Design a protein around this ligand. Structure first.
Ligand SMILES: Cc1cc2nc3c(=O)[nH]c(=O)nc-3n(C[C@H](O)[C@H](O)[C@H](O)COP(=O)(O)OP(=O)(O)OC[C@H]3O[C@@H](n4cnc5c(N)ncnc54)[C@H](O)[C@@H]3O)c2cc1C
Length: 388
């Protein structure tokens, strides 16, 4: 029976635990593995907007998410001289409304994992090889141990090892949106109180906020650049490049960058999207960022993870475990919605910053209202199936 179908879920993030939840609810018996030793606390703030709120509520975790929601009360667009150009309430500032909510990744994963306390999960575990045939998927773990599964669903992030193991370069694209993003935590030296500041130029943007940790502040950087690092993963090159890229930005960048060396959670990466004609091959399926990362410029990453988890789990249910039918339905039903949200991400990367003009209240206000309207449109641009 479906209960006895062996399903491996790789990755304890959003999509992995989410699909595990729905698989378990729909009468399957998934297992989780995780390369990290444990769920990393805090981290990047994630939006739950559009369809994802409905799914979150059905999962019975919505109130828990709200209890752990970010609490920015005020967001401000400021010029390099510190003057306020445009101010908005926190949710509106984050282009959210209605029942939509923002939460730090670590807080959400913790809630997700509590919702699946029954499902087996193994941390500090990694797959080093995958081979499949018509009957089974043979998984080789780090220590050389082998296990066979009926299905493997990989939710191991944008830099998916599984994607590289299973798919060829002709079967997926790494779409570069021509910009870099960086972030790190520093002492709240300005003494911000549940407030975010945002300064921008023609090709660059800098944010600074404090929220749940009163004596800490999260710095953010975004900028367009055709420059390519000799080693994009070299953290020292990343910092030199970031410092050099913003050396004439003004405002608080000097004060932020002076504190960058002592920050312990430094992050830097190109803004990228994953585009695949098919997220599946045989008995293996990709989900979440591994399959269709819309990049942070979209604000849809979480939304796509939840919807994907629901649909893939659902189609497997209706197919009574028949993965060939389910994976086809998974690809067909979800691609337009994914492509819609990715294109919104592409649009943001091309048009958010003003290439020729300086920003003002009217621009920031008009741009904000437009993004709020457009994001609401795309995030709800799917008629979700009802598998129950
Ligand atoms: C700076 C930044 C800002 C963002 N802002 C937003 C936003 O405002 N709104 C929004 O909706 N989205 C945002 N995102 C995107 C969002 O974080 C992700 O889309 C979302 O977390 C999807 O989660 P996932 O489970 O698909 O992937 P992840 O959450 O990345 O899952 C990866 C997990 O898999 C594990 N893993 C990795 N490799 C392996 C392996 N080989 N074997 C086993 N396990 C492995 C890792 O330990 C990790 O726990 C942002 C991302 C970044 C980087």
């Amino acid at each position: 029976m479906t209960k006895h179908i062996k399903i491996l879920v790789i990755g304890v993030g959003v999509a992995g635990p989410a699909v595990a939840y729905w698989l378990k609810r729909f009468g399957f018996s998934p297992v989780l593995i995780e390369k990290s030793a444990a769920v990393r606390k805090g981290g990047q703030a994630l939006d739950i907007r559009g369809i994802a709120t409905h799914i979150a509520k059905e999962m019975g975790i919505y109130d828990q998410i709200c209890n752990m929601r970010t609490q920015i009360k005020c967001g401000r667009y400021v010029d390099v001289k510190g003057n306020v150009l445009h101010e908005e309430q926190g949710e509106t500032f984050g282009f959210r409304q209605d029942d939509e909510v923002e939460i730090l990744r670590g807080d959400l994963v913790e809630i997700l994992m509590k919702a699946i306390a029954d499902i087996p999960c193994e941390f500090k575990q990694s797959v080093i090889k995958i081979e499949q045939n018509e009957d089974s998927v043979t998984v080789t773990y780090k220590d050389g141990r082998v296990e066979n599964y009926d299905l493997v669903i990989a939710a191991d992030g944008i830099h998916s090892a599984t994607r590289g193991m299973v798919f060829s370069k002709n079967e997926y694209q790494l779409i570069n949106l021509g910009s870099y993003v960086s972030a790190f935590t520093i002492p709240n030296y300005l003494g911000l109180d549940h407030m975010e500041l945002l300064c921008e130029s023609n090709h660059k943007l800098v944010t600074l906020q404090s929220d749940s940790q009163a004596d800490k502040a999260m710095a953010g950087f975004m900028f367009r650049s055709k420059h390519v690092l000799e080693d994009i993963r070299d953290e020292q090159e990343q910092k030199h490049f970031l410092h050099a890229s913003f050396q004439n930005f003004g405002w608080e960048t000097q004060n932020i960058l002076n504190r960058m060396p002592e920050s312990d959670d430094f992050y830097f990466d190109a803004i990228t999207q994953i585009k695949m004609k098919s997220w599946t091959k045989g008995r293996i399926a990709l989900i979440g960022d591994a399959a269709y990362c819309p990049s942070p410029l979209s604000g849809q990453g979480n939304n796509l993870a939840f919807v994907g988890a629901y649909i893939l789990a659902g189609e497997l249910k209706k197919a009574d475990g028949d993965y060939i039918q389910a994976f086809t339905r998974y690809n067909e039903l979800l691609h337009p919605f994914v492509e819609a949200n990715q294109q919104f991400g592409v649009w943001v990367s091309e048009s958010f910053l003003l290439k020729d003009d300086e920003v003002s209240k009217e621009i920031a206000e008009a741009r904000s209202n437009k993004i709020l309207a457009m994001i609401k449109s795309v995030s709800n641009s799917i008629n979700l199936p009802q598998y129950e």
